Structure formats: C-alpha cells, structure tokens
Amino acid sequence: XXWXFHXX
Amino acid sequence: XXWXFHXX
Amino acid sequence: XXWXFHXX
Amino acid sequence: XXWXFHXX
Amino acid sequence: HHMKEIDELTIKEYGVDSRILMERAGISVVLAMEEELGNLSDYRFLVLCGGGNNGGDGFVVARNLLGVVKDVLVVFLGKKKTPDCEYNYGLYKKFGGKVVEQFEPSILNEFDVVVDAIFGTGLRGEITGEYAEIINLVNKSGKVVVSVDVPSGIDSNTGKVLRTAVKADLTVTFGVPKIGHILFPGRDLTGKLKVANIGHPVHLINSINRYVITREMVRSLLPERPRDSHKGTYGKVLIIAGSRLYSGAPVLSGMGSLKVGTGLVKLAVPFPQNLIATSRFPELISVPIDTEKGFFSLQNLQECLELSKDVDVVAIGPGLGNNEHVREFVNEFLKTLEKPAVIDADAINVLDTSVLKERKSPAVLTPHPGEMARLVKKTVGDVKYNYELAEEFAKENDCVLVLKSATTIVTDGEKTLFNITGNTGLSKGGSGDVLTGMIAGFIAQGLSPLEASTVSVYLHGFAAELFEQDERGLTASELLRLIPEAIRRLK
Amino acid sequence: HHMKEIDELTIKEYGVDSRILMERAGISVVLAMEEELGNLSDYRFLVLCGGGNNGGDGFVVARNLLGVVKDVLVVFLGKKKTPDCEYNYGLYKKFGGKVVEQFEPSILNEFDVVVDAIFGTGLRGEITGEYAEIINLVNKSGKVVVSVDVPSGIDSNTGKVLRTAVKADLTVTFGVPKIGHILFPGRDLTGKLKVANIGHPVHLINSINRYVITREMVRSLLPERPRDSHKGTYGKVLIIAGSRLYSGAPVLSGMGSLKVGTGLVKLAVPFPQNLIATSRFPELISVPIDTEKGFFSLQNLQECLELSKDVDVVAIGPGLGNNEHVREFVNEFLKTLEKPAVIDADAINVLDTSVLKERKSPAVLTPHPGEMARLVKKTVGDVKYNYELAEEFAKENDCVLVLKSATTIVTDGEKTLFNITGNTGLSKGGSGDVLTGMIAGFIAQGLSPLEASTVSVYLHGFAAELFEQDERGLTASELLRLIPEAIRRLK
Amino acid sequence: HHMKEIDELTIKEYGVDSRILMERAGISVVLAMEEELGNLSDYRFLVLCGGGNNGGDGFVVARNLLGVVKDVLVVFLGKKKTPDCEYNYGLYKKFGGKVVEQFEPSILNEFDVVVDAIFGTGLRGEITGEYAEIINLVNKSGKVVVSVDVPSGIDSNTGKVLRTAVKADLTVTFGVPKIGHILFPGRDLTGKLKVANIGHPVHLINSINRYVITREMVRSLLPERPRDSHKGTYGKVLIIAGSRLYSGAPVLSGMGSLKVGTGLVKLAVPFPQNLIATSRFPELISVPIDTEKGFFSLQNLQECLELSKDVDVVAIGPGLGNNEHVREFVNEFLKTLEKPAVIDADAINVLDTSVLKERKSPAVLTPHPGEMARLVKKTVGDVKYNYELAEEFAKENDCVLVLKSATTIVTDGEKTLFNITGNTGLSKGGSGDVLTGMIAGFIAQGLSPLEASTVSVYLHGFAAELFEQDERGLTASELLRLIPEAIRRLK
Amino acid sequence: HHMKEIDELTIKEYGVDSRILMERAGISVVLAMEEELGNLSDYRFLVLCGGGNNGGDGFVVARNLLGVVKDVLVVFLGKKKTPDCEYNYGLYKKFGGKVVEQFEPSILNEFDVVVDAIFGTGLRGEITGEYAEIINLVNKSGKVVVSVDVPSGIDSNTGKVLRTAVKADLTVTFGVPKIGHILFPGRDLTGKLKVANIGHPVHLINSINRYVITREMVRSLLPERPRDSHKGTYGKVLIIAGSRLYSGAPVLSGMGSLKVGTGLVKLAVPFPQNLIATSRFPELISVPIDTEKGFFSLQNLQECLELSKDVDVVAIGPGLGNNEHVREFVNEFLKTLEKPAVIDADAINVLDTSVLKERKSPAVLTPHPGEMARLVKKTVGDVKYNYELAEEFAKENDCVLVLKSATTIVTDGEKTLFNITGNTGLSKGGSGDVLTGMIAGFIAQGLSPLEASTVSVYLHGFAAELFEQDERGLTASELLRLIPEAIRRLK
C-alpha cells in the first residue's frame, strides 16, 4: 500500500 | 498502530 | 537441575 | 547468562 | 456535547483552519480505503459529492486520488457549495479532475468504488426525488461503497433512515463515532466503521458524554481478584425468580452471577421448582418458597426480606409471572428493600415506577423495548433506540436503565453507553435471565450499578460471539459456558 | 524447629564459617536474578542494605555485581553493622564499591533493579519513620525488586506486614521457605520465591516439621490402583448432607469422592432432595431420608448409624443447615459413630468440641476461617493463618484440622503442612463441598486422615488451576471435571 | 527543476494553502514514525524546531502527538518564525503544548525520540555555534532520531555535511527524495528514508529530471526474451582488454556480458593471456592478439577494427595498461570505430576527450572518481558526487557518463539517474570489469546506452547485495554468479 | 602476571578469606557438573583429593554433594593437608562424609563420576609411583571424569604432561583459563573447559597479559566498512610468491587477502606461473616476473621494490623456494622495503634475522614450528608451544610472531594471544598460504600487525570449522570459500 509513502 | 484510526 | 534452588 | 562461567 | 460544536470550537477557539480539518478528513478517507482495499492503483472511483462540507471532503478525496488510481470522476449533485466545498471543488478542478453534474445510471458500471459524500451529519429531512433515485441505484449497483462521515440518508443523531440511505461497505467518520453509526438501522448501513483523528483537540474529543463500550474500558472496570480472598470477598446475590410456569429462569440468572465470579448466589424460587436449579447446577443455593398457587405473593414478602438481609444485591423478575399477587409482592418488596436491586422481565412488567423514585437504594432496570414501552406507556417504536428517553427515565427514577437491543443502551441519566457486542443468538429466551444475574454479580463484587451494567452487557454479548457454531443455535446454557472465556479474552 | 537455629548449629556445631554461609547466600541471590532477568550486564542495581546479616548478604550481592553490570550502588541504611555485615561492607568497599548512607528519592530513576536487603527474618517491630518512607518509594518506583531472604517489612514467622513492606518481583531465601513466604499477605509480597541451598547440612534442613505440600509429596501419597481390584478395594464413603434449603451440597461432596477413585459413594439426603444427586450423577447412591421438616434430626440418628456400618468413612455437614435439631443429630451421631469422620460446614457450626475429644475414631475438620472463629469463639483475624492455633486445636481434639484459605493449613498438631495450590475460583460456594468428599474418598482408599487431607487440598487447588478460562468463572461442577486431569498431571 | 519551486507552484498556481501542505507534511512524519516505532503511546518526544518551515512542520508533528503519547516538548531554537511556522507554533500552544527556548543538554535523557525539525532543505551555510553544540549532543544521545525533510546540517542539493549534521534513524521527506538523501555523506545521515505524498500535483512531482533508479524502472527497461530467438537476437559484443600484466580483466567483462543474456561475446586479448578466459569460461571467445610486448598498440588497430565489423558494441579498457602505445591505440581505435563504445578503466586513463566529441557513434564512460578526476584534470573531491559536472561532461562529449561510487551517477547530460544498490563488496578490483561487460551486453541486446547503464548499475549492485555471506568477502567471480538471480528477482 | 598471585592479592590485599574463595571454587565445580550432567541426584561420585588446595576444593565439592546424590566417597591421597584443605576435610567429615585413604582399583566400578582433585596448578614434578597407577586406572575406567582446576598431571604453565595425567571430560578452572588448558597436550586432556568466577576482583582478572582469542574480541577488531568507500579505502596488498616449482601458493595468499575485504591485491609471480592465478581467480592481479630459472633473485629486487611503492603491505615467502638466489633477494628486499611485511614459509627459511631487527617498518612472521626451529636453530620440541621463546623472539626482533599449531601463539613480545579455532583440516599444504594473505589483507585495511594476526588466525580456523563435511577433506580452496561465512558469523 503506497498512497502516502514511496521507499528510497 | 492507532494514531489515525479508532475501531467501532 | 536442582542443586542450588528449590521452587515454592 | 554469564555471571558464573566463561567458555574456553 | 456533539461534533459540529467540536469542529466549530476547534476552528473558532483553537484556530485550526477549517480547510485543514477538511484536508485531513479527506485524506483519512483515502488511507482508510487503502487499508480496506489494498493498493488503490488499479481501482476506478466514482465520487458523489453534495454541496455541503461532506461533499467538500469528497472533493478532497477525489483530488487526492487524482493521478494515483485508474480513474476518478466526481458527480456533483448539489445546487450550491459551502465555502470549503467550493475551495476543494476549485482545487480538484485545478488538479485536472473531471466533474459532471448529471448522474446517468449507466455511469456506475464504468467504476469499481463509489465514494458517497452526498449528505453528511445532521441531515434532517426525508430524502425523496432524484437524490433518492441515485442512492437506490448505488445500492443496486453491487459496487464497493465507501461513505464519508455517515452513509447518506442516515440521521447521524438517531441512526434512522431518512426514507432512503446508502448502504456502505466502509464508513470513515471523524473524531468520534456518531449515534447513527451505532444505532440501527444506521449501524447496518455503515458497514465497517473507521473513526479518523482529523486533528481536533483530544480534550474536545473527550468532552463527549456518550460512548461505545470498548474492550479496554471493560478490562479496566473488571473487579480485582486478590489472592488472599474468601467467598465473602466476592459478594452475595439473592435472586427472586421463577414460578410454576417459568421454572428455568432462576437457574440462568443464578448461574449468570456465578460465572462472573460472585462468591455466593442464592435463589428464592417457589417449591418444587426451586429443585430444578440445583439439579442442573448444585453450586447454587435454591431456597424453596412455599406459595399458595405457584407464584410469589405478599405471603412471601417477609421471607424474601429476611433472605435479603444477608446479601449485597437482589435480582428480581425473571420468570415470576404477571398477576396481581406478583405485582403486590414486587412493589412492596422493592419499596422496602434497602439493597441494590436489579429489576428484570416480569418485575418490570408489574413495576410501579413511584416505588422506584421513592427508593433510597440503587436500581438497575433491564427492559427489552416491549417491556420499556409498557413501563412508560409508549409504543415500542417510540422507545426503541430512544437514548434520550432512556436518559430522562433514568434521571427521573434515579436508576440505571439498560435498554436491550442489538445495540444496548446503558445510562444513568448522566452518562450513556452503547453496547455493540452480541449477535442474533441472544434473540432467544433465557438470554436476558443470564444478563440479569451477571449484573447482580458484578454489583455484588463492588462495581457501581452503571459499571456492573456496562461490563455485563459487553461480556454477555462478547460471550455470544465466542459461540463456535452458527449463532442461531446459541442458547442461554451455552452462553453461560462461554462467559469465562469472554472474561479471559478481555485480558 | 527454625532457620536461625539451623544457621547457628551449622556454624557452632558443624563448623561452617558464618562468612561462607553469607557468601553463598549472596551469590545465590545473583544467580537467581540472572535466571529471572537473563544476562545482568546491561542492568543498574540499587542495593539497599541494613546493618543486619540481611544487609551483609546485600553487600555480598553488590560486591559480586561489581565490574560485571552497568552500575552498582549500595545505600546503607543501618546505624551499626553486625560483624559479618561489617566484613562484607569492608570487602565491597575494598573492591571499589560506592556506598552512600542517604536515600535521596530521585536515586531510583538512575537504576533498573532494587535489591532489598534492608530487613531480614525475625523482624518483629512495626516499620515507621524513614525506613517506611524508603520502602513506600521503592514500591511506587515501578523498578524490578529482588528481596533478600524476605521482603523487608514482612514478619517471616507469620507473613503479616509490619506496617509496611516491600513488594518484591523475586525473593531468594535460604535453606527453606519461611512461614512468611507462604502465608498472606507475605506470600503476595514475596513474588516469585527461590529457595537457595547455601550449605546447611541436609539433616538440619529436614529437622523442620512444617512443609509446603509439593507435587512430589502428593505423587508419593497417592494410593495404589492394583490391576486386580474390585469396587471394594477402593473403599466406601457415606456422606450425610443436604436439607430442603441446601439441596446441591450432597451432589458435590459425593462426586468429589468418586472423582478421586473411591469405589462406592452413598449419600443420605432428606427426601426428595436426595433425587437431585442421581439426576445429575446417576453413579451416586442417594438414599432418601424421611425428615419432619427438611432437615436431619435425632429421628434420623438410627438410620444414619445403620448406613455407617457398611462404609469406611463418613463425611457430614455440607448443606445440613444450622438448627437445634441438626445440632442434636450431628453431635449424637459423631459421639456414637465408630468410623473416621470428615466434619464440614454446618456440622462444624453445630459441633460440640467435647464430642470430638471423646471420640475414639479419627476426624478431619475442614473449616474456613469464619467457621473456625465460631468453633473456637475467636475473631476471624485471630484465627486466619494462625497455624499455631490450628496445631493446638488439632493436638487438643485429636483431629486433623484443615483450615482453608488461599494458603490452606493442614495439621494434626505434630505435622503442619501448607497448601499453596489454587486460585480465587475456589472462593465460591460448592468448592468446599468438593474438598470434603475428596478427603473422605482418600481416607476410604486407605490414606490416613492427614495424608488424605494433604493430597486433597493439593489436588482440589491444582484442579482449579487447570481451568481453561478465567478463574473467576470456575464453579464446583467444572472443578469436579478437572480433578482427574489434576491426578493425571501429578504423574 | 526542484521542490521549493514545486511547493511554490502548488501554492500560487494550483491554490493549495501552504498551511495544508504543512499539515500534511507534519502528519506524514507522525504516520512514518508510527510505522517505524509501532504504537507511539508509550514514547516521549523531544521536538527541536527552527523558525523556518521545517520548524513549522515540527510544530505540526508536536501538536499532533499532543494528548496521544507519554510526553511532548518543543525546544524552539530559532530567533524569528515564518508565517506558517508562527501559525503552527500558535496552534501547538493553543492545544496546550509546552515550548521552551533553551536547550539544556540534560533534557534529552527525559525523552525517547528526538524529532529534528531544525533546518530544512536549502540550508547553505556551515553550522557553528550553539546549533552545532545541540546537534552534536543529539548525535551523542543514543536516542531515536527522526529528521523532518532532511537531517539538519545536510545540504539538500549536494548531500554534504555543513560542518555538522544530525544523524537520523528515520527521515521523512516530501514529494521526492532530495539529492542530499541520495548522495553521501547525506545518504548515511538520512537513515531510513520515507518519501511522503503531501499533496503536490503528480504532474509537478514528475517535472523532476533526476531520479533514483528503482526496481520497477529496471524491470520495465529489461529487454525482451522472445521464444523464437537465436544467438543473433541478443547481440554481439567485442571486448578489447587485457595485457600481460592484467590478464583477468577480460574474463570478468566477457562473463558480465554473457550473464546479462548477450548472445555472443568475443574478447580480443594479448596472447597467451587470452587463454586465461576460455580456461575459466569456455563459452567465451577469446581471440589471441599478437603484440610486441604484452600490450595493445597501433600494430593491433587493424585487427581490432576488423573484429569490430561483426559486433554491435565494443567495450575497451579493462586491464589494458597505461603506456603511450596503449594511448595511441585506444584513441585511433575510438576515433575510427563506428560502433557504440563502452570505455572503461585504462581506456579512460589514456582517453583524449576530443576523440569522444568527434565520434558519430555513442559512448558510455564508466569512471570511478579518480579516473574522472584525471580525465577532467580536477581533484577527486571536486568530481566525487558532482552530478552537475558529470551532466556537463556528458552533454559536452555526447556520451553517457556513469560516475561510479556508493551512489553511482548515470547521466547523458539531459537525464540524470542515481543508483543506490550495492555494498562495499563492490569496493574491490574486478567489480568494474563486470559492470563494463554488462553495459555492453545490454547495449548489444538493444537498450540505449543510458538505458543499458541504468539497468546495469542497478543489477550489478543488487547482485552484490544478494551475496549470502559477509559483503567484504564478495569478489567479482561470485558477483557474476549472482547476476542471474538479481535479474530473476527484478521480476 | 598469574593466578596464584591473584589469589594471594585477593586474600592478603582485598581481604577475601581464602576459605571463601575455596567454597566458591568447589561450588562452581558442582554447578558446572550439574549443567553438563543434568540433575546429579542419580549419580555416584568418587572424589579423589590431594592434600593441597586442589584437594581442599574437592572436599568442598564432596561436602556439597552430600545428601543430594546417590553416593559420595572421598579417597584422600595426600600425606599432609594445607590449612584450607584441613578445614574442608574437617567439614566434610562433620557433615557425615566417608573418607578412605586407600585407593583399591575395584572401587571405581561402584561410581559413575570421578572428580579429580588430586593435583592442581603449579605441579612441577613428573608423576610416578602410586599416583601414576591411580591416574592410569581412572583413565582406563571409562567413567565420567571432572577435573578441578586442571587435570592432575598437566603442567598448568605449559600444558605438558608430567609423565601421566588425567583425561577429563570436564574441567572447571577458576578466574581464567590456564596456559595448560590452552596448549596441547593439556588442551586435549582438559575436555570441556569451564572458567568459573570464584570472586577475584575483576581488576586482577584483567591484570593478565595472555589471552585466548574470542569471537567478541575479533568482532571488535574487525575493520569498518563505511558505505561511502572505494577500493582505495580497503588497502592494497603486494604478495611476492611462487616459483616454477610452487605455482599455486600465490593464488591462495592473494585470494586470502581478497576474501577478508582488501580492495586491491597484486601478486608478483615468476612468468608463466603468474597466469595460474588469474585463470583460477581473475579478480586478482598477477604480474609476470621475468626470472632466469623460475625463481626470484636479485635481478628482481628493483621491480619488486617498484611494485611495493604503491601498496600498503607486502606479503612474501609462499612458494618461493629455498636457494641462495631466493635468500639474497628476500633479505635485500626486506632490508630495503619500507612497508609492513608479512613474512611466511620460504621467506622465513632464508630469513636473516639481523635484517628483521634493522627494519624500521613492521613485520609479522608466520612460522610453523619446523620453520621456527630452523629460524632460531632450536629443535622443534624446544620451540613447539614455547610461548616464552616466541615472546622473546618478537621482543628482540620488533615483530609479531604467529607461531602456528593447533593452538596458535600470536605475540608482539608484550601481548600474547592464543588461538584455539581450527581443526586438523588445516594440517594440509595451502592452509598457511591463505592465512598469510588474510593477515596482509587485514593490515592493508588498517589493523595493526598484531590486530591483523589475531583476527586472521581466529577466522582462518573458524572458517575450517565451518566446513560442512569431514575436516580431513578440507583443502585451502574450500577454506577460502568459507572465510566470508566465518566473518558473517562473527557478527
């Protein structure tokens, strides 16, 4: 689940 | 983890 | 193993 | 747990 | 006292821009959908917005899905827009969002999720016209429905359907659950409820004097089981119940008291029906009451008062019957009894409420709505889920009122709690008899009447939910068995 | 007879330097903490030492943690030091240990573990003053508390709190458990108890004539189940119980006898209340006793004596009621009965103790402390946990006294055992009725009254602990069900 | 081009109130901490705020923790406050938040988490004075440190430390990662990076022409493996490498091409050093080049050009040596070669950049920073992580520059990508030789030079991370083995 | 410097009664046996005691088993008793322990465990007579043997057997391991060694300047792998090795350097033998050295010195051969080389030690005992396990001496470490070549020569232990493979 945050 | 949402 | 300690 | 004994 | 007042204070007094509260509300809806649907990329969203701040929240949701999911369309249904809904409409369009103002029925087969931001809280009027047509179509659509704040068409203060309402799979409300999420039909239409924190001061959130009863609250009210204890530590209950016609009621109440940890439970039951109780559960004390014709009467007043002397709480009413001799007995008994009373079933049915006002000692009344209706001489429809009536009744009569239903209302006129544990297995004779004993049990162990009522309604229902097979096969005996697992599972 | 005498003999007669005993005691505290906390490297230890040998032990602990853990500080609270405490203070300082003599309250947030070596065994006087202030702070600190020997403030000979006492997570005592670890409140304040072997001759350790009842002792007392056996092999019990008011008591006692493996159990219960027993458990024999008014009386003496002829043990008292006719009956019966008697509940309440002295045959009395209080005409507070009173009562009356409480005292006046199995689920009517039958059961199978009482109290309690859900939901019927698993789990 | 411009457009052009963006930023920090720390209730938070919008974000965080965690304190370090930081300071205080303006060193032992909102992005100047003292204390504190946007003291445009910077366990930035999160030392100081969506139009987020290379991007660039394929489908590579001194370089490059799926790989290596390659990997074609003294020279120009005719890409440089004859050869060869060239190691060291500008055919140069430094006649410190220099070099010379380091910069002067896969196992001879072949391999299979460089740097590094034991034991041969698992794991 | 001195200080200076130290020692033996044998109840113990303090410890053990196990017997073998042994003999008898003074051979079939407390540390003289007869019988008995302090008959300062010694399954020593537990044969005779803390000040325990190399020590010496690193960060090694006869040595050394994380490894090997290295491992740089006849000579001095200029460490010796031309070369090279040198194998065999004293730069010599013997012109038996000789050699020659054997001695003349990792798989050509490169590798990465030697010997051996099949099948190539798992397993 990716609406709020992306990784690096 | 409970900052945003409470249950019922 | 019980040389040193007994329980209750 | 290491109070009493060290290894080798 | 309520949420529009809390919003207003948060804005006017605390100084949070209303647009911020609105952004947070909308964002919270997205995160809630994400956690219910998983990754939202592959979904197509139809957002239906009114001109109110509910619609405004919907525009926030729509804007926040823009560029991030397969499709977004807003059907704006309102005639005018509030300032904050206008601002967010404005931003949605600035961000390249498509809005239409016509709801063509076919439109919803082009989408997976319907976000219902049409009407919010404090909608007062019956929905008719095209709004109704639209809501009916959505409900026939078989799409996933997420409602903003409350499903549109539900009265947020009562849970009643205003002619027609959206049936949501998920509802994301803000600050606190609303009475309409908690009472039926509203509770059914809400689906899964998430309560988002959208930035109100925690003080204001706690300014609210109506509560859902939670596991944590009950855990914290549960009495102490100090190791150095004796039977005496855990209280003594008398239960006055049963009749030649209703012989099993006493057994269920008595066993209800024991299963919640009461030290000593005594029944007074007309002989030989008293023997039924110890045959089933020999831990119980079931005292034979010699009666003329199988029912308590004034002939038994003195014996029951004597039995009351050496106990902490008296429960009365389960299976007593309803005749004039029972009436006389129940009212003289309660008028004279200087002990907390838990008044159930047939005792409520013959109760003179004057007697209740005149009592120095506490009482808990546990009516189902037909009993309440007869007690206040109103229709069931008047009394069912009528929390204000129950408050005023409790306040007037200095009692705790536990008005039973799928959502149970517990109130002392000052504090009002809502129980939402349970299932339809409790819609069966015997259930209430169990609850009655549990309450008396918890009072006996030292909880106030309100505390005992809160804890008991919660567990009674949670115990029904722990039944291992189909709920509709649940019976009171099995419910008794499940009580100690419910208590374990609290902790 | 006790531990200070054992220490003294070990020193003066056996020749163990008292400093060696002390080193071992301290070392044993470290190893016990290590096994409860795991690796002690990362912990900071606040050791609180008095000037007695308890404090001396604390200095050994502190010295032995020096260099090995994150921090050690000793707050020395005493005014003077014993020789061995002086020696060990001396060594602690030689090894570079920091000592302060002022307890500043803030000090305990700089530490994880409080080692309480302030007061040891045979502290007689009420703790007031700054000692109290310090102990209260420690108890409010929320730190891990390890007590040396006994939590400071507990009377090691009675378990009573001397105004205030330390509440320990762990207590490490030496040689044997002390009466104050075993009786409440002391037993609660002790937390987890470890009994360290610090070098006393094993002979002296066994010179002690008071014992905790252990699994191993009970395993070894449990009667033999030889394959070539018949009903007759396992004894016959008569249980005289019940009344029109207390109909379920007989069922619980009778079933208690059966669940422990008794061959034949017979109840004499007033009719028709006798029928309650076989409806629940048809394995039982429940003989109808024709009574005038629902209670045993002298009219039933002859019938009960006849029934007694063909059994090994008679249990009497559960649910009989307390009136003069019951009194007459119980005392004439016991005066005349030439069989072991287990005397419970209402039979104790009407018991004339003269009758008990005059009996050639054995007896076991199973009072809870209110029954004991009435029996010896003392206050409950006088009799509760009063092992010396119970010994003297047993010795005077040639009986076995099982004085029930969270810790149960079993004594024949010569040997005194303490039971520590059980939980607050046993603080509920019916529990005692079960125990009564178990005892009679074990006597019937051939155990002496004391042996039967030891085994029974242990299992009754262990069975309560095996209940699968919350203890407070435990009832006697469920306890009966759990007895055979308790017996299995012994072995 | 960058984030302050994106914020500004989002505000001024799109119309999002800057306070909303700020609320979202702060909220996003809380949710990120919640997901790293779990339930935040039991934590005590020290929030350190500057007067900039970073500090403003910190006030949002602090306000949002108010009432919800064990403790919150803001130490406000600024002298003045921006409007939005003032607004949020205002709200924090309105909500009952404690602020102090003095940082007492002891303060941080009263807290578990330090939220660093002191300095944000575009901090230009070296931090000295008490700001430094404070940041050093925080870094010595051993507390959990969460940085807002960037760890304070890191130049967000370069990753350089401005005398001193916070070392964060977690950093939550907004919109996109910043160059200072990606380049060292900044990348080390950032700890775990979360990139929050705080509401910028997705268009603007994608207006950015610098990117971290992600799994998904590489998955999508990976060439097709159509079932009906032959060796020819997957390209032909020539690799000109090796010398009498550097015999193993050719083997690693050649094997690098094969492991990425190239159809045919041919090495031209001075004889007999060419035999080393087929002894290790007989799948390779290793052509003997007859040389005067063990090194390529102009004597070999013609043979290498002929070999170049029947291949798609030529890789040159690994292990060639650096003498004048090699120099002459490399430059005449590249001047004349009408094929894409991957230019590595010693070929870069002798490269005349004029030759590179004058080439019609593409090139990729794979310098480590010492090679780059010599190539542009700058210091390593000038060139290391100097993405602007690398862009301008690529733009000027019409090449793709892969400037290797723990973060590798791949640029064609228009698009600039950052690789963050890998570990220190790649800091070992042979590593670069592998990468060189992979690039040529991917070019041969049809990827553009930039695409081939992106994919290769990513996998080369990911392959190092898949090594099963300690990274420092990783060698190039093992890296080759791991390449196909890296490719599998892409998909 | 040693343990009898530590005991003495602990007694005379710190003030611990020697009887306390002795009680602790004995107790520690019981707890150690308990943890090796489990519950000791069912065992029969034959304790064999001398008249020294070792015997005294045995009496403590015996006394402490009294009453607690199936049987205890002490055979007291001494003629006289020390004061503390007398005291503990005294207590053993007081506690009812049986002592005999005659060892009848048959006696040991009546027992399961032999506790050997006959001779302790600092036994100097060869055991003959009946003591020998007794020890031989015990060793033939097949009983479980626990030795107190050291197995009787082992010289605690050398590990040599004094004609005959007990072979123990378990040995419990106090304070620290003794040289005789660590060196063979003593290390074999010790069996499982437990080192008990019997109360010596931790300062004194650390006053000891000889150490076993532990996992934790090596973990802490392991160099840092900072993310922002390049090849250059991890050092450069030159390895001068190989000859026409010994072509594989260079490959193993070179690969040893790489597997420990060295950035760049270069070999200088006579051509064409240099090609062998890059065929096996193309990551290596293997420089062809043109030689007259297959061996290094002074003709190569200049080239090797040039190669040495651009590296951090030079390793020399593996596979060079031993002729006069090699001798000349090695010594002129080392005389002139201003870089740390790791000197192995054939380089040691031709080494002029004068050259070694005269060097400004550091050196590590890695002799096996035959190489050491030739180097100092002593017999292997003189030099094997001769830690004092190795110290003095290191001190005299300003080098680190790694004297290889199953226990490896690493010393710089001031600090002496003992490595006990490894197995007989390392007793095979190639093993030493690997270690040589590892050391150079660790020096190159920045560890001091002593640190690099400590870490390397430990890992080299631990890597041999990680081999998955029978140790005797271990070869150097497989050992190389296992190095990175050994490093991982450190952490």
Swiss-Prot record, chains E, F, G, H:
Disulfide bonds: none annotated. Residues 3-206 are annotated as: NAD(P)H-hydrate epimerase. Pfam families: Carb_kinase, YjeF_N. Binds 1 potassium ion per subunit. Its cofactor is K(+). Residues 368-374 are annotated as: NADPHX 2. Keywords: ATP-binding, Isomerase, Lyase, Metal-binding, Multifunctional enzyme, NAD, NADP, Nucleotide-binding, Potassium. Its EC number is 4.2.1.136, 5.1.99.6. GO terms for molecular function: ADP-dependent NAD(P)H-hydrate dehydratase activity; ATP binding; metal ion binding; NAD(P)HX epimerase activity. Residues 214-490 form the YjeF C-terminal domain. CDD domains: YXKO-related. One of its GO terms (biological process) is metabolite repair. (6S)-NADPHX 2 binds at residues 319, 433. Residues 214-491 are annotated as: ADP-dependent (S)-NAD(P)H-hydrate dehydratase. Transmembrane segments: none annotated. It catalyses: (6S)-NADHX + ADP = AMP + phosphate + NADH + H(+); (6S)-NADPHX + ADP = AMP + phosphate + NADPH + H(+); (6R)-NADHX = (6S)-NADHX; (6R)-NADPHX = (6S)-NADPHX. ADP binds at residues 404-408, 423-432. Residues 3-206 form the YjeF N-terminal domain. SUPFAM superfamilies: Ribokinase-like, YjeF N-terminal domain-like. (6S)-NADPHX 1 binds at residues 131, 149. Bifunctional enzyme that catalyzes the epimerization of the S- and R-forms of NAD(P)HX and the dehydration of the S-form of NAD(P)HX at the expense of ADP, which is converted to AMP. This allows the repair of both epimers of NAD(P)HX, a damaged form of NAD(P)H that is a result of enzymatic or heat-dependent hydration. In the N-terminal section; belongs to the NnrE/AIBP family. This is Bifunctional NAD(P)H-hydrate repair enzyme Nnr. It comes from Thermotoga maritima (strain ATCC 43589 / DSM 3109 / JCM 10099 / NBRC 100826 / MSB8).
